[PDB]
Amino acid sequence: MQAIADSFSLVKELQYDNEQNLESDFVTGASQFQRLAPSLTVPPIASPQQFLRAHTTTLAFRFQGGIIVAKVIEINPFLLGTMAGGAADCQFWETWLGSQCRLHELREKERISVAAASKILSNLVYQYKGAGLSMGTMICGYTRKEGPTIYYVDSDGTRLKGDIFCVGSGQTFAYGVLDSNYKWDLSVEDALYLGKRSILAAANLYHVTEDGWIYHG
Amino acid sequence: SINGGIVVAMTGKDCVAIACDLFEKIFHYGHVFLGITGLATDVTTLNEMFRYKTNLYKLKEERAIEPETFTQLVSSSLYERRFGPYFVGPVVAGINSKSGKPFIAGFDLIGCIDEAKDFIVSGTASDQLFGMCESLYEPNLEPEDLFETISQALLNAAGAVVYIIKKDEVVKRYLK
Amino acid sequence: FNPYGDNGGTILGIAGEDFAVLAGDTRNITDYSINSRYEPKVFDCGDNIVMSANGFAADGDALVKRFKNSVKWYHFDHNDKKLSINSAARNIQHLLYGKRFFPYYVHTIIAGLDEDGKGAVYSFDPVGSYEREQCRAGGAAASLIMPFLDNQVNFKNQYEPGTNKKPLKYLSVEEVIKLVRDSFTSATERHIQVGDGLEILIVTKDGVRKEFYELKRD
Amino acid sequence: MNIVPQDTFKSQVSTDQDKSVLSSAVPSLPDTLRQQEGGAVPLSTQLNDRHPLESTLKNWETTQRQRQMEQYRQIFGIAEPMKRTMEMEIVNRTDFNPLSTNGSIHRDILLNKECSIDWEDVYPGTMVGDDVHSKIEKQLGI
Amino acid sequence: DRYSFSLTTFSPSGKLGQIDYALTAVKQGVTSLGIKATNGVVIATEKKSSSPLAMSETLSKVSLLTPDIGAVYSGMGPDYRVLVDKSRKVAHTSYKRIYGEYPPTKLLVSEVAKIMQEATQSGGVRPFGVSLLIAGHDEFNGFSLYQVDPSGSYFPWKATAIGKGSVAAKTFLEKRWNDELELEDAIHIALLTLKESVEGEFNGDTIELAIIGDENPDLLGYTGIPTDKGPRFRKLTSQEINDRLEA
Amino acid sequence: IILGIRVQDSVILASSKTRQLSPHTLMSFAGEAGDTVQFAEYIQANIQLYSIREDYELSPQAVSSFVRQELAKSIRSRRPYQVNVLIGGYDKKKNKPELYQIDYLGTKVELPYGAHLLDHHYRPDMTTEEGLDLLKLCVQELEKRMVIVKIVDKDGIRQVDDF
Amino acid sequence: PIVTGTSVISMKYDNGVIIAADNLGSYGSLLRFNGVERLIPVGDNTVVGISGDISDMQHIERLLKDLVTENAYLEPSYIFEYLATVMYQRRSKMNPLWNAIIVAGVQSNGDQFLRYVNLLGVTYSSPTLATGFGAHMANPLLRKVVDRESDIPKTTVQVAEEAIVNAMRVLYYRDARSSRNFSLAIIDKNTGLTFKKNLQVE
Amino acid sequence: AGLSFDNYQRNNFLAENTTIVGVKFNNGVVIAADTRSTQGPIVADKNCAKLHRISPKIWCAGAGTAADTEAVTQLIGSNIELHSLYTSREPRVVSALQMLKQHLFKYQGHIGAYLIVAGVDPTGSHLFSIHAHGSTDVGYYLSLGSGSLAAMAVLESHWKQDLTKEEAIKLASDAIQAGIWNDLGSGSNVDVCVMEIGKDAEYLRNYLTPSYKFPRGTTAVLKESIVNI
Amino acid sequence: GEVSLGTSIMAVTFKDGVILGADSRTTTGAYIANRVTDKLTRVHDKIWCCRSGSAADTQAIADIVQYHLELYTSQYGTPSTETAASVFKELCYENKDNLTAGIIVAGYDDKNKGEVYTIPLGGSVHKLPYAIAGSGSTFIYGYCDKNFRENMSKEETVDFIKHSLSQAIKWDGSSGGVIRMVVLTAAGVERLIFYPDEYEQL
Amino acid sequence: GEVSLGTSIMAVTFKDGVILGADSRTTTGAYIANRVTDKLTRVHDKIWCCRSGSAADTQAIADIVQYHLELYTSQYGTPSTETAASVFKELCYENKDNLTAGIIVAGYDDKNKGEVYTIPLGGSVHKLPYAIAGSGSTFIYGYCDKNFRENMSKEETVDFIKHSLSQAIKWDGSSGGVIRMVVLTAAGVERLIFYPDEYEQL
């Protein structure tokens, strides 16, 4: 009863009745920094999307030794993400993804599948599809079961797997020069050479291994 | 495209006719026949809905729905979606099992009832077929004279099916 | 400012063998208000030509006055020579297309006899395509008028009973007049714009005759 | 003291705003299978170009009730709205019925809707999550 | 507090105690009865009053549910009143507003039974302490008479009686009922049964009686729609009831 | 691009993607990225849940009715996304192929062939070899105007390298 | 259109024609100018009643005085034909006169004359004509007195006048732009043109 | 619950691809209407009955979206029936007016029903107009629909205080006839309903009411079948 | 196209109380939908208001006010006019984004002996000796400001309101018909009506 | 953003002639660009006008009128005020689609002994006993209509114009400053000016 009464008992005008407002302004503790899936403000209007609107080259392929990728957000020591599109959106959502991965690995006591991680990413991006989040993260890793694995993820929620991904301004030159040389049975330093040649044709190296990704400068 | 097309219903002595240019657009729920023009997705959704509703009716009442009650059911089911209606033009035709009264009706997108006693047309080429039916139609047609009148009017509207409905029997016919 | 309006009403040309019929309703409309119950919608233009520019009334009056004046000049220049129905059609075509980018917002029909004395009807697009036609309805209830007549003067989609086409027939001028009568009765019964009266011009080798028939006032 | 519902748009949106339908694998995204809404395809971003009336017709009765409670607070004091609300919550919280759609017979009396019809009465309007157990879990908060 | 335990429960015998006690409350209520004729139905009851100063014209024990359907009860009058209000509302909302016509008696009885049953599952309310006799006509099912009990069970009856006199009334009906009664015969048998069941003063002001019969266009309140049907439910005036009693 | 042919023995489907809904039922779809594949995979998860719960394959007609209903229910809340779906299945109860097309509005129709020419070629009595030849012809005319290939069969679903 | 004239109403009767106008120019909702006479007699045998833009009214009134001044070097039909031609050519110039005009009069043969013309050049005859709001409210009342051209010989001048005054009363009741003051003219084949200024609804 | 919105966005995307009068008189009120009905320029049904009944002695006629006027009129007739049963009293016309205007106000004019409500009750005869936004005004005579101006012109020319029943029926039917003749939307028959304060309401359907068949075997039957049901 | 209360309304305090007067025309465009509408709305026995803006929103507001004030009266006895004005203010303001309502509130109250409050479209409240509102008020601001006097007699205030509303009716098309007034005093409520023939000949 | 002559101007005929009065405020939005502008424009010795609408178009029109009338005077001697009003009418009308001008013309003329013409935005011309125009005129329609009398003396007409323009200035923001008047009579032209301290304390 008394709780009911106190609902009928100055805070309305500045809206510090609203619990989510009290949290957002850090009145009711630090709870805004205690939630996964950070809450995003939306303008309280009939056409939020209208109000919002009114506001590099990289490569990867699978090979015998793993994947070489050639702004690559270190999502985890076993997962790499090519920041693409809006840098703010990439940095934020890739950090959130890295935290979701850490939670998954803690709960299940396995390294997350690159398929699983890319699916989580694409699902979240889709959920915000149509409101900002310009995004093109290519997801790269190696898992004992899966082996070398590649997934591209898009602002539009596309998710696609393939042995080669060429993206950015020289993507067609990189793809042409690579296909002239690409093989599965490349030797490690041979694949590094072909990678550097294909980036140079499109003018960082990261080597991806069962024991994690390695940066070769 | 299978969207749209035309449906017409027409009254005789102790009989009614309903016809369309054809997927299918005439449905029946016992002795009450519903023709629906419009989007084929909405035609199908209406058929599924009125099958559901009339099956529950028959189960609860132990009785087949009468055409007047089905007309009111259709009216109320269309008005339920007053905002974003189905883009459909339904037509009901049937004979009351008790009185033998031949009955036809037709509706707008939101279930206004015409209940006109002579003839009802809906859909594409409606004004052409209104002119045809007004010219050709005469009251108290015999069942076969009614068949000729409805079928000729439909053929002159612009591959067709005709139902001739008695109290105790229904005859289904096709037209080129 | 919109320079056009819709004045309603309807016209109907029928070509016979030795006759042509042009019928129109006499009601004048604006919005849901009756402007008048008897405007003569169809005009004798002389030279055994009858004309009606259905649609926007003012542009129809302008076009028919320009046509009649052009006929006057045709007579002056060619010493009272009878304007042929094909020459009349070509004149009206050039009158219409001269408005190509500001067209007369009207569908117009002329009826007459050709040099054979055969019934002739011509109908013109507001930008002046035209065809020789045996019958043509026009105006708001044209879709009501025409299919019935296409079912009663022609026998289209009819067959000899059980012999799953019945042959077409020539019709006497009074019989087609009676079919126009019945057609307009049905259209005034079902279309709210079809006027309070029906006026029929009969073109014959003897000249033009005017007939008028009352229709329902509602 | 409102006639037309004013506060009628969500001020904040999150992937986790919808509780009781969250993915167990990743407690940050919806469960699109359990939603049974036709996939993720009803993404929350698609809550745009709503009918102008809808956001007022859904919560019209709530606004009328709030105005009524406000009037009772102004004229009779804090006791009367408190009593009304306590009665109403007692009724709502003690009527559990997972099979019936119909409104409680006493709820209508308290609302003074014994002799009133509305379209919500006339038109009271699934492979997963329709079960009685889902209603039990919603009601107890299991 | 999110849950309230069920107030009605099975006893080790398998009997639902609150249902038995509601049926006992019904047994304690004043006698009411109903009788199908071939051409109508009678429902009748005693207007027991706590004082002679009470206005008997306000003791509406018999109430119209639809122009073709009426109800009477024995037991807790407030529960009957709330059930009547809800049954009328559901007759409009569920049926008249969907099909444009009043429900058949069978389906309105089923709706009342559903409403009464759910009070037997709830942990917030007791069951209703009333049984209702619902008499009505349907275009297809004809005249019908149902007895609804506190459980929300219902059965169709040729004649029945409930309350204190229930057993003796049911025996008098079983000996006196026959498949050929006219509505005036059914009214006479009803009046004789109630005379035998009533306690103390038996007069046209201590009784009320309603019938389902032919349409009464003089009760329709308008003229000129010839297909439109006057109410078949008609309460007898105490004048008319007294004129019956003088038979 | 998607294409399908119903043959006397099999259903043949082709596309320039697809999901297996059941051992004897295949789905192919075209439309907007994300929306189309999120839909197709929700459908796949639903048909798999049904098949597990019943330990029985849902018939191709019931599958296509479910997809129609789910597509209509998907549209009701939001702007219609452009999608088109071909469902090819072998009905093991009637022992015949069935092919259904569903448009972006949830209009479902049973078709002898469809895509998102063949009237001069298609015959109901064709064998799957004749069907594969007609598919080759159709692709040849498509490349004149400017694939993965699946077969549905008594023995299930088959990949064809003769693209 | 800034200053506008309310409405003209008219009917023909056994021996002539009656026309009436409410003598008021409104500046939008402001009834700014009273005594704006909108019935313009054009010689003995016709009155041109004009409605709409009062400035365009005064331009058509001077076109009519120019017409009379040139003729002095008229039938109602000639004045109408000229007016209609001006109106239609202004329309086709995309420079309309924002007016509706009734030319009422009697031909020298004694035929009653009534034609309506508007800014579009739409024209029609009738036993009764009204412009603007009068076309919706007044016309129904006058058409009860003369529904068809066979009623003309049955309709006396006294009844036509009482009908016109009643229709003006109804307009004053139900037209927000109506004045109580109005002018009425009777054009009779026998007695000529009678032009009653400053009548009042009563 | 309620009126669904569930295809609003869908139908948007796809789109991107009468005379009525009431006349109060010395002991009652008369309401009348024409019986034409139209879809576009086309007469969808002659002899359409436009006079709805809210209660035995409360009657209604409406313009605007026909389905809306029908639905709201039958909802308010249901609420008036239930309220009369609850209070055991003959319903007031002011109660119908109140709940009808509060309903139309709830929908902020999106339910496009415009109505004239006439009735008699224990407090006398009443005649009201209601607009789709929920605004009401009382009157002694009213007109509605496309012919509302012609009917009001007639009423204002011929209406008088202390009309008799017969004079009031005559006036109402004259105003409907003026609509029929002067408005295109109105036509066909005149319906009248007469409510007197002491009397049953007198409904007067059609109070005023102002071959080509082909030989058998003409049509080319393709094939025949028996459907049984 | 909602109904808007095109109007001239005028409340005037005087020696014994307050007089609230109004025209009785209401218009839908140029059509007078009712020419004898009673715009004076009783919200309490001695508390009256006049409505402007939309008819639907103002009627809903006034009905909610009458409910609130009847409830108040049942609890505390008769409200003051300031109470009523407060309720009007709160309803007009908290719905200001959805509803367009402007109200003149007049009422007698034996402690205050008659008060006038105007609530313009914004939902401000201003106590005044007299208030004018509606389309026709604009034409009579100078007349009322020159001719108003404090502590007029009843008869002087009736004359003043007649002359003002008659000029508003003269110049405004949207206001007209009969003038209606309520006189609110300790003696009671008195209805007054003045017809065009009683105020146009002024 | 053209300059518009937000204004209150008022011409009044009286026993000896006509008085034309105006405020002297001109505004660009809320800014008073000149607070002592002289709005009274001489087009001839005894023929004066006041301008409303755009300042540029009205100044061009008035200069063309003054040219035309000086030429006339050089040919035929002094024009009548009706001549001047005719020239104003023709310029306002034939440019009506391009120019927005409204003019009150006042002038003395010994055959007519003083006349007033108003030419509203439409380019109609209306002879009146007095005329008011501009934003501030709306607030004083009832005052001038009640207080105006035919054949006032000079002093009575000066008082009347002072009281009217002072109320217009009181209620209209767009008009203010000093009141300026010209008195036009057979005796000559007399300039008058009244300052706020001479008319606000009224």
Q: CATH number of the domain that H46 lies in? A: 3.60.20.10
Place of tokens 């189905």: B86
Choose the closest CB to C32 out of H183, H214, H221. Answer: H183
The parent domain of residue C41 ranges over: 1-218
Give me the amino acid identity at J126: H
Query: What residues 150-189 of chain J have any CB closer than 8 A to a CB of chain I?
Result: 163-164, 167-168, 170-171
**Host H or E run for residue E132:** strand E130-138
| Subunit partners of chain E (3 or more CB pairs within 8 A) | B, D, H
Return the SS3 of G4.
strand
Question: How far C137 CA lies from chain G's nearest CA (Å)?
Answer: 23
CA distance C99 to F6: 57
Residue in D with minimal Cα distance to I98: D4
User: Can you read off the two tokens belonging to residue A74?
Assistant: 């270190």
CA distance I5 to I130: 20
What are the residue numbers of the active site of J?
A: 7
Beta carbons of I60 and D60 less than 8 angstroms apart: no
DSSP single-letter state for residue G189: T
Q: What is the 3-state secondary structure (H, E, C) of B127-157?
A: HHHHHHHHHHCCCCCCHHHHHHHHHHHHHCC
Whether residue H1 lies inside any domain: the answer is no
Question: Residue B59, class by beta-carbon neighbours within 10 Å (0-12 exposed, 13-18 middle, 19+ buried)?
Answer: exposed
What is the CATH classification number for the domain harbouring J32? Answer: 3.60.20.10
Look at A7 and D11 and tell me if their CB atoms are within 8 Å.
Answer: no
Beta carbons of I107 and I114 less than 8 angstroms apart: yes
CA distance G185 to G179: 17
For E180: left if phi > 0, alpha if psi spans -120 to 50, otherwise beta; the answer is alpha
- For chain H, the straight-line distance linking the first and the last C-alpha, in angstroms and rounded, comes to 35
Label the pairing between strands C207-214 and C28-30: unpaired
Place of tokens 């086309």: H42
Look at H178 and G144 and tell me if their CB atoms are within 8 Å.
Answer: yes
Whether residue H3 lies inside any domain: the answer is no
- For chain F, the straight-line distance linking the first and the last C-alpha, in angstroms and rounded, comes to 14
Place of tokens 């040139």: G70
Contacts of J148 in chain I (CB under 8 A): none
Choose the closest CB to H57 out of E60, E85, E221. Answer: E221
Count interface pairs F-H at CB distance under 8 A: 19
Q: Which fold has domain E1-247?
A: Glutamine Phosphoribosylpyrophosphate, subunit 1, domain 1 (3.60.20)
Count interface pairs H-I at CB distance under 8 A: 36
Question: How crowded is the C-beta side of I19, counted as CA atoms within 13 Å?
Answer: 29
**What is J131-194 written as a DSSP string?**
EEESGGGGGGHHHHHHH--TT--HHHHHHHHHHHHHHHHHH-TT--S-EEEEEEETTEEEEEEE
Choose the closest CB to A40 out of D14, D48, D81. Answer: D14
I168-to-G6, G29, H212, J138 alpha-carbon distances in Å: 19, 12, 66, 11
**What is H59-72 written as a DSSP string?**
EEEEEESHHHHHHH
- For chain G, the straight-line distance linking the first and the last C-alpha, in angstroms and rounded, comes to 31
CA distance H53 to H93: 12
CA distance E220 to E231: 6
Q: How far is CA F68 from the centre of its chain?
A: 13
Compute the CA torsion angle H120, H124, H125, H128 (nearest 10 deg): -100
The parent domain of residue I116 ranges over: 4-202
Beta carbons of E34 and E135 less than 8 angstroms apart: yes
Bridge partners (DSSP) of residue A80 are: A140
Look at C35 and G120 and tell me if their CB atoms are within 8 Å.
Answer: no
Beta carbons of I169 and I137 less than 8 angstroms apart: no
| Subunit partners of chain I (3 or more CB pairs within 8 A) | D, G, H, J
CA distance H33 to J140: 47
Compute the CA torsion angle G31, G33, G39, G43 (nearest 10 deg): -170
Decide if G150 touches C, using CB distance below 8 A: no
Question: Residue I148, class by beta-carbon neighbours within 10 Å (0-12 exposed, 13-18 middle, 19+ buried)?
Answer: middle
Number of Cβ within a 10 Å radius of residue H204: 18
Helix axes D60-76 and I55-76, enclosed angle (nearest 10):
30
Beta carbons of B21 and B159 less than 8 angstroms apart: yes
CA distance C1 to G93: 12
What are the counts of helices (DSSP H) followed by strands (DSSP E) for chain F? 3, 10
Contacts of B157 in chain C (CB under 8 A): 147
CA distance J78 to D99: 100
User: Can you read off the two tokens belonging to residue A13?
Assistant: 């005008």
Which among F73, F72, F63 has a CA at the least distance from the CA of F27? F63
- b/e I43-52 (16+ beta carbons within 10 angstroms → b): bbebbbbbbb
Chains F and D touch (3+ CB pairs under 8 A): yes
Q: What's the domain count of chain I?
A: 1
Residue D50 CB partners (closer than 8 Å, separation 6+): A46, H5, H8
Which among F112, F109, F115, F108 has a CA at the least distance from the CA of F29? F115
Q: How far is CA A187 from the centre of its chain?
A: 30
Tell me how the structure was determined.
Answer: cryo-EM
Look at F37 and A129 and tell me if their CB atoms are within 8 Å.
Answer: no
CA distance A141 to B99: 78
Give me the amino acid identity at D69: M
Question: What are the structural domains, with CATH classification, of chain F?
Answer: 1-163 (3.60.20.10)
**Host H or E run for residue H202:** strand H201-208
Decide if D32 touches F, using CB distance below 8 A: yes
User: From 3.30.565.10, 3.20.10.10, 3.30.365.10, 3.60.20.10, which CATH number describes the G1-202 domain?
Assistant: 3.60.20.10
Beta carbons of G46 and G113 less than 8 angstroms apart: yes
CA distance C159 to B148: 11
Residue G193 CB partners (closer than 8 Å, separation 6+): G41, G44, G45, G47, G185, G186, G187
Chains G and J touch (3+ CB pairs under 8 A): yes
J19-to-A102, B109, G61, H156, I90 alpha-carbon distances in Å: 92, 69, 31, 46, 51
Residue H172 — φ and ψ, nearest 5°?
Answer: -60, -45
Beta carbons of B163 and B171 less than 8 angstroms apart: yes
Return the SS3 of A154.
coil
Compute the CA torsion angle B107, B111, B114, B119 (nearest 10 deg): 20
A84 in a known ligand binding site: no
F155-to-E142, F21, F162, F163, J140 alpha-carbon distances in Å: 60, 15, 19, 20, 97
Label the pairing between strands E222-223 and H201-208: parallel
Decide if H72 touches G, using CB distance below 8 A: no
CA distance J141 to J132: 8
Residue H141 CB partners (closer than 8 Å, separation 6+): H21, H22, H23, H24, H127, H152, H155, H159
What is the CATH classification number for the domain harbouring C195? Answer: 3.60.20.10
Return the SS3 of B20.
strand
Residue A196 — φ and ψ, nearest 5°?
Answer: -60, -40
DSSP single-letter state for residue E10: B
Look at F107 and B40 and tell me if their CB atoms are within 8 Å.
Answer: yes
DSSP single-letter state for residue I129: S
**Host H or E run for residue F115:** strand F113-115
Give me the amino acid identity at D79: A
CA distance I194 to I179: 5
> Is the Cα dihedral E115, E120, E125, E131 positive or negative?
positive
C143-to-B126, C108, C136 alpha-carbon distances in Å: 10, 16, 11
Resolution, expressed in angstroms to one decimal: 2.8
Residue A162 CB partners (closer than 8 Å, separation 6+): A150, A152
Residue H215 — φ and ψ, nearest 5°?
Answer: -65, 150
Decide if F81 touches A, using CB distance below 8 A: no
Q: What is the 3-state composition of chain H as percent helix, strand, coil, each rounded to the nearest 5?
A: 30, 35, 35
Choose the closest CB to A44 out of D11, D27, D48. Answer: D11
Question: How far F23 CA lies from chain H's nearest CA (Å)?
Answer: 34
Choose the closest CB to J120 out of G27, G57, G95. Answer: G27
User: From 3.40.1350.10, 3.20.20.80, 3.60.20.10, 3.40.50.1220, which CATH number describes the A56-217 domain?
Assistant: 3.60.20.10
